[PDB]
Design an enzyme around this catalytic site. Structure first.
Site, PDB file in Angstrom:
ATOM      1  N   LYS A 213      -6.954  48.305  94.095  1.00 13.08           N
ATOM      2  CA  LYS A 213      -7.988  48.964  93.316  1.00 13.08           C
ATOM      3  C   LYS A 213      -7.491  50.285  92.757  1.00 13.08           C
ATOM      4  O   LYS A 213      -7.976  50.776  91.736  1.00 13.08           O
ATOM      5  CB  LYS A 213      -9.251  49.132  94.172  1.00 13.08           C
ATOM      6  CG  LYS A 213      -9.558  50.565  94.602  1.00 13.08           C
ATOM      7  CD  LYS A 213     -10.945  50.636  95.266  1.00 13.08           C
ATOM      8  CE  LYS A 213     -11.032  49.725  96.507  1.00 13.08           C
ATOM      9  NZ  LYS A 213     -10.610  50.423  97.763  1.00 13.08           N
TER      10      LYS A 213
ATOM     11  N   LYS B 219       0.438  43.027  95.895  1.00 13.63           N
ATOM     12  CA  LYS B 219      -0.973  42.706  96.013  1.00 13.63           C
ATOM     13  C   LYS B 219      -1.809  43.499  94.995  1.00 13.63           C
ATOM     14  O   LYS B 219      -1.421  44.567  94.523  1.00 13.63           O
ATOM     15  CB  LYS B 219      -1.480  42.939  97.447  1.00 13.63           C
ATOM     16  CG  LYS B 219      -1.918  44.387  97.734  1.00 13.63           C
ATOM     17  CD  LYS B 219      -2.704  44.450  99.046  1.00 13.63           C
ATOM     18  CE  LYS B 219      -3.134  45.881  99.403  1.00 13.63           C
ATOM     19  NZ  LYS B 219      -4.132  46.466  98.442  1.00 13.63           N
TER      20      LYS B 219
ATOM     21  N   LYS C 109       3.040  53.231 100.317  1.00  9.06           N
ATOM     22  CA  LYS C 109       2.319  54.276  99.589  1.00  9.06           C
ATOM     23  C   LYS C 109       3.118  55.574  99.519  1.00  9.06           C
ATOM     24  O   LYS C 109       2.963  56.361  98.586  1.00  9.06           O
ATOM     25  CB  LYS C 109       0.943  54.528 100.207  1.00  9.06           C
ATOM     26  CG  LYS C 109      -0.100  53.469  99.862  1.00  9.06           C
ATOM     27  CD  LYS C 109      -1.244  53.457 100.867  1.00  9.06           C
ATOM     28  CE  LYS C 109      -2.339  52.477 100.454  1.00  9.06           C
ATOM     29  NZ  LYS C 109      -3.299  53.065  99.468  1.00  9.06           N
TER      30      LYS C 109
END
Ligand code: ATP
Ligand code: ATP
Ligand code: MG
Ligand code: MG
Lengths: 328, 328
Positions: free
Chosen positions: A195, A192, A111
């Protein structure tokens, strides 16, 4: 019985990956364990969240938890921020985690991958999640393969606290499904499904309409073989589509390979879209029921009430072990 | 009137540096401002604290605040951990501070200087301190030269929050004394006097006995001149001793230079010890009064009650700006 805790960030509308990897199993687990299912809004702000979006996302997540079948009388459904103990235990836990253990977290590096300035919250994500779990004397943590490393740190942190100050925490254990633990992005089969992916084509939200699901499944990345067979390394996109198809339909990868012998990506994708649409159908209906009533707010009030009772007592125990504040 | 906030860590018994640089001024400031004086126990655990020592240190700090003259009816005296809003606002503030702003803090680099493994709390010290201040719409922050950089970050953080989400915070201002803002270690005149220095000879606690103060002043580092005159660069130890002597006695550095003309380090140190002892005398007496009553606990209960009212409302305002939780 044993205790379960698990959180979901209201950082967007949950996807079928979130569903397949975790939420779906909560529905069955609730009858066999003492469960605490959390809407982790404090975890969500580790990156920019539009305030109106976050508020809305928080209410949508709660409705979806209940829509998939979480029964507020069998489990405790609550919002993280409404239980001050999470921020309290998070502070205490970050005074015991080492800076190096935080920088080595792959979620942090991922991230934070290729960003100039990053929030401290991104880095200190783990102590808060460790507090989330540790607060309720949790035995089992249902996730979510990408969450394995966090649970491992959480265990190291509970052990360090236990040996440093005295036995207080139950050492939690991750419970990762054998199937569906890692649904991939429809657009990049090497990542992956998230959302919060900046590309909406990457995921299918539990709130996506039929037309939208058909487009997303149609645009899904495949290959030039035109052969429906499972091969994670050689055929990542098709293998992921087969996995989604398999867990949602109840058919084995192998059964699907036979049924699609002599076909046919166009037809395979068209079929899969309908399978997802048919799965989401009853869920979306109940979601709309919850969204339009005050019953949603009563469930959350009662859920925070129960969580506060349990967590604030653990916090008191933690402060007593560390020597914080005064004798109570 | 304007508002003041200031904390002291219960990480050991406060020293004459703590006294001269901050506590002493709180006593006068309380009559002209709305003051919140805090015992910051959550800041203290950023490094190892023995649990029994911390508990004791927390109670001793409160007694000393009151012993020097803080009047619980003119100011709010409280313990950080007893107000959950500090941990709450600290979490929110760390999701807006950048990791680089934390690593550039000189206190971080200093305290982390030459350590293999360090606590995340050491690094995230600033967002908690920023929350401490920002929570009460503080205008003035009485410190403490070493605390200047933290207050500057706190201002950047309130500004970033204000422009990112909407005007909420008062931009605080540091109030650093012209004199005594930086009392040096008696043992290393290039370092400030720290209550947690591993060498007890470095500082004089407000609880030190006469015999102990005489030893400490006697062992204080000087030079081979034998000339009592102020020269921070050339005569760091003697200049610091003159500063302590000057602020505690009310005489100018210049008056002391004349009075000690033709002397005489032995005599200068013997005199200074008595000056410190005479200053600490009335303070220690009242400290013992507070330590032996339950009045100390009533003051703290009432202080946390008032602080909770103000802080939890600021936290609610902050969550409403960021979109956390639900509408209230
Ligand atoms: N692709 C995926 N496949 C299976 N499970 C997943 C997947 N992504 C997330 N999960 C599980 O979903 C749960 C909720 O996690 P989380 O809220 O972080 O979702 P997310 O989609 O990764 O969101 P975000 O992108 O904002 O970080 C956890 O149990 C997590 O491990
Ligand atoms: N040597 C000093 N001279 C003048 N003021 C000081 C000095 N050291 C600390 N202060 C002031 O004392 C107050 C309390 O700070 P703090 O609790 O951090 O003390 P400390 O002695 O530096 O403790 P520690 O070593 O545990 O960090 C602040 O306002 C701070 O700036
Ligand atoms: Mg995630
Ligand atoms: Mg300090």
């Amino acid at each position: 019985m044993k205790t379960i805790f698990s959180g979901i960030q209201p950082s967007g509308v949950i996807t079928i990956g979130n569903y397949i990897g975790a939420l779906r199993q909560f529905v069955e687990l609730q009858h066999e364990y003492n469960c605490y299912f959390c809407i982790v809004d404090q975890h969500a702000i580790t990156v920019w969240q539009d305030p109106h979006e976050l508020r809305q996302n928080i209410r949508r997540l709660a409705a979806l938890y209940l829509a998939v079948g979480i029964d507020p009388t069998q489990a405790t459904l609550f919002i993280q921020s409404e239980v001050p103990a999470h921020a309290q235990a998070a502070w205490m836990l970050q005074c015991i985690v080492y800076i190096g253990e935080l920088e080595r977290m792959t979620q942090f590096k991922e991230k934070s991958a290729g960003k100039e300035a990053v929030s401290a919250g991104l880095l200190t994500y783990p102590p808060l999640m460790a507090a989330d779990i540790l607060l309720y004397n949790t035995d089992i943590v249902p996730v979510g393969e990408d969450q394995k490393q966090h649970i491992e740190l959480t265990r190291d942190l509970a052990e360090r606290f236990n040996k440093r100050y005295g036995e207080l925490f139950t050492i939690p254990e991750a419970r990762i499904p054998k199937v569906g633990a890692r649904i991939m992005s429809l657009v990049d089969p090497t990542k992956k499904m998230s959302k919060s992916d900046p590309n909406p084509k990457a995921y299918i939200t539990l709130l996506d309409d039929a037309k939208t699901i058909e487009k997303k499944i149609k645009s899904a990345v495949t290959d030039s073989e035109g052969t429906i067979r499972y091969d994670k390394e050689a055929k990542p996109g098709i293998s992921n589509l087969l996995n989604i198809y398999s867990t949602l339909s109840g058919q084995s990868i192998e059964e699907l390979e036979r049924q699609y012998e002599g076909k046919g990506y166009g037809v395979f994708k068209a079929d899969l879209a309908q399978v997802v649409i048919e799965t989401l159908r009853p869920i979306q209906e109940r979601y709309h029921h919850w969204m339009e009533s005050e019953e949603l707010d009563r469930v959350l009030d009662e859920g925070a009430e129960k969580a506060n009772r349990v967590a604030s007592e653990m916090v008191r125990k933690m402060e007593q072990a560390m020597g914080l504040g005064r004798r109570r």
